[PDB]
Write a protein that binds this ligand. Structure first.
Ligand SMILES: Nc1ccn([C@@H]2O[C@H](COP(=O)(O)OP(=O)(O)OC[C@@H](O)[C@@H](O)[C@@H](O)CO)[C@@H](O)[C@H]2O)c(=O)n1
Lengths: 560, 129
């Protein structure tokens, strides 16, 4: 039985917060209790820890903890540092004890709870401690409320430090207002000139040209989906009839070179076939002529998670009146069943969505490329010579690129490393490119675990792995072509479904075990049962064409 | 003294503070400087400092009202957490050496001298109790 440590009661002295409980199958003599954030940047030992058998009480001081200061705004876990840490899971007694002592109006408010996390949070609001200056003020509040965080599915101590807006002298305030006004005017002038040049450039042709434009705000140089379309075009002598132009930007928030700033709208107006791959906000602010075509070759493969208008009414989604994805004429998807979901996503007619196959998947059905890439990955990563290779590859837990994050602490390195040692297998990790965290690797960890977040080719590693522990990413689509099983780490399924759900129900869509906790991983891999009998139906259904000729069909459909 | 206070605070390595001294809390000291707080009251009885947070007349949790202490001296080890959290300083800073003003209560000669002096200056204390 795994050693666990629980929280039994939460006291509150004047400013001093107490946590008491017990642990099983664990000697606490050399325990080092801490308060560690989800992002793993702040650890702070409990000021006093009194230990009596398996029972314990931890004396936490919210006034002197942070190296002498107060606990800043964050969410903290109670972690028993040791050779192996332990995140203290709340006993169900605590959440039972509150549940029976609701006053009737609390019960009336209690019924409108969607999931278990809302029930948990509302029941645990009776352990809240709010510190207001003088006890009256409602504008400076230091509140600590124990709760099970939905995003990390783990007990945390949310500390919210509400502070008033502190304003500087009137000179600085006037300067800030003037700077904001100048920035707004600059943005308005840039939008005006962009619209003007684009509108003028298209208005001087009014005819069918021979120019093809590839654009992507998040792909420096030509690569990815465009590369296969471009190569298929060049193969059948389509560079001897059309002229091809490319406008690229390093990232969404980056700025553009002097030439490209005004070359992009000119080509947008002039181009008959305009290519995009992802959110390209400079295109959804203009109006196109009918003869033009805007081809949306989405990076991902299938309709797994919500995108575009399909998340309207949800946080981070566009209102139904926006033009954020509507200026398309031919959006290309990999399966027939993706037509309604993706047409809904882009807000375009369903005839604009064609099931030809995403050109990026051209290589997954190839054979010479398979041996080539296998040799390359064996030579450049000799550690993959184990009996089996496993690949962790979760998606970002944040709302978007601006809020990119991942609470890695959900993964315990040591147990997976011990499984690898027992099984002579290697597990590789590839966080999403929209991440901000950096992996940390220990002594035995380096001998099995490999941090892979730099490799340019996304599908580089999928050719070698004999498993895939991913939760929500579209990587399962590409990996599905190899007749291999995968395990799904549905760690925060309730919260994620609440924020952005899936175009299909999660429990049945996934081709593999569903898994919520780490123990479920050691159960699945230790027992070596994965339910791969359903990955072949998934590949059969969610891939319309298995010929590996997606780029050929895309170019044939677009140009003839 | 208006000119002497900031200059002396800046250049003095050891600084002794007896009670609430608001000026010393508006500046940041070097790590070499040792700011010492020797509280007038002997022991920890009535809620002082950051322990009044949430009560009327109590500082906010983020205030710097007693933080700039390097050492605080207390009567006994059972006051280390109370006074450490009252000043909002680390528990290592607070040390149980005893209050300097309690050094006067154990001297026999002064006890006898002050007994005679109080007998003289208060004739009423001639009584038994
Ligand atoms: N460890 C990893 C995991 C994934 N990848 C690549 O990243 C691309 C998208 O992955 P992900 O879906 O997670 O990103 P988004 O949320 O922005 O996709 C929004 C939505 O359109 C899409 O999911 C679709 O399935 C639903 O319509 C894919 O090409 C993956 O190969 C990677 O390089 N490394």
């Amino acid at each position: 039985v795994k050693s666990k440590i629980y929280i039994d009661k939460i006291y509150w002295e004047r400013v001093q917060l107490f946590v008491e409980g017990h642990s099983e199958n664990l000697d606490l003599e050399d325990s080092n209790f801490v308060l560690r954030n989800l992002t793993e940047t702040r650890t702070m030992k409990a000021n006093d820890v009194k230990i009596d058998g398996n029972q314990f009480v931890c004396r936490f001081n919210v006034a002197i903890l942070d190296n002498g200061y107060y606990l800043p705004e964050d969410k903290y876990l109670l972690v028993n540092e040791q050779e192996l840490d332990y995140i203290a899971q709340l006993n169900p007694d605590v959440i039972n004890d509150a549940y029976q002592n609701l006053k009737p109006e609390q019960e009336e408010e209690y019924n409108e709870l969607e999931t278990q996390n809302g029930k948990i949070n509302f029941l645990l609001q009776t352990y809240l401690k709010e510190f207001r200056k003088g006890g009256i003020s409602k504008k400076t509040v230091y509140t600590v409320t124990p709760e099970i965080s939905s995003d990390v599915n783990e007990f945390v101590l949310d500390v919210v430090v509400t502070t008033p807006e502190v304003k500087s002298i009137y000179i600085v305030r006037k300067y800030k207002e003037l700077r904001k006004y100048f920035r707004k005017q600059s943005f308005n002038t840039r939008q005006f000139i962009f619209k003007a040049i684009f509108n003028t450039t298209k208005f001087f042709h009014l005819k069918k040209g021979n120019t093809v434009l590839f654009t992507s705000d998040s792909r420096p140089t030509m690569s990815g989906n465009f590369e296969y379309i471009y190569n298929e075009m060049l193969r059948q002598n389509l560079d001897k009839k059309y002229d091809i132009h490319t406008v690229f930007k390093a990232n969404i928030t980056d700025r553009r070179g002097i030439i490209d700033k005004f070359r992009l709208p000119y080509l947008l107006g002039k181009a008959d076939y305009i290519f995009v791959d992802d959110f390209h906000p400079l295109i959804y602010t203009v109006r196109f002529r009918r003869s033009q075509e805007v081809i949306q070759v989405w990076n991902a493969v299938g309709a797994f998670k919500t995108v575009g208008f399909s998340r309207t009414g949800k946080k981070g989604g566009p209102f139904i009146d926006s033009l954020n994805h509507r200026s398309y004429t031919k959006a290309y998807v990999s399966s027939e069943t993706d037509i309604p979901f993706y047409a809904e996503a882009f807000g375009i007619k369903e005839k604009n969505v064609v099931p030809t196959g995403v050109p990026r998947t051209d290589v997954l059905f190839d054979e010479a490329y398979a041996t080539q890439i296998k040799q390359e990955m064996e030579d450049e990563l000799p550690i993959i010579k184990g009996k089996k290779v496993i690949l962790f590859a979760p998606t970002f837990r944040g709302s978007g690129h601006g809020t990119a994050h991942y609470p890695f602490f959900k993964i315990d390195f040591e147990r997976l490393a011990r499984y690898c040692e027992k099984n002579n297998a290697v597990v590789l990790f590839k966080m999403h490119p929209f991440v901000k965290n950096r992996l940390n690797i220990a002594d035995k960890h380096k001998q099995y675990f490999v941090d892979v977040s730099d490799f340019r080719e996304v599908n580089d590693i999928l050719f070698i792995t004999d498993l895939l522990i991913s939760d929500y990413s579209s990587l399962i689509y590409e990996y599905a072509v190899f007749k291999k099983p995968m395990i799904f780490y549905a760690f925060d399924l309730e919260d994620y479904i609440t924020t952005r759900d899936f175009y299909e129900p999660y429990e049945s869509f996934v081709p593999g075990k569903i898994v919520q906790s780490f123990d479920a991983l050691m159960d699945a891999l230790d027992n070596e049962d994965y339910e791969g009998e359903k990955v072949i139906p998934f590949l059969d259904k969610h891939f319309k064409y298995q010929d590996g000729r997606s780029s050929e069909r895309l170019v044939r459909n677009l140009f003839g």
